[PDB]
Ligand binder design. Sequence first.
Ligand code: NA
Length: 130
Amino acid sequence: KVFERCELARTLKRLGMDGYRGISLANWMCLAKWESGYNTRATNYNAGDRSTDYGIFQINSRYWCNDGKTPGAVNACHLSCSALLQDNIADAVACAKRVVRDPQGVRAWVAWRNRCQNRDVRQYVQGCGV
Ligand code: NA
């Protein structure tokens, strides 16, 4: 499903993402925006290394979820990548929390560095009542 901005903002706060491992809600919104356009069904095949990015946070199959076709991959979130394509984002959120528990933190996603880091991200949560 494609979330509306504020709808997603409120959902993420209820799922405990605000300030998770030091990452503000506005940063998570900036990330979801640039990764999928707030679309839970988005997938991106990376022909270069044969891995696929899944869902709203575009989580990669090489380390986080299992899709069976990615060479030498692990499944740290202990989830089928299918779980990351549901309309209910609970599993995607639990996995995203797992990703940021690693040393890189939110820097794990290159898109965050390009379009969110050191920018004014307040705009993503403005007027949503969170
Ligand atoms: Na995997």
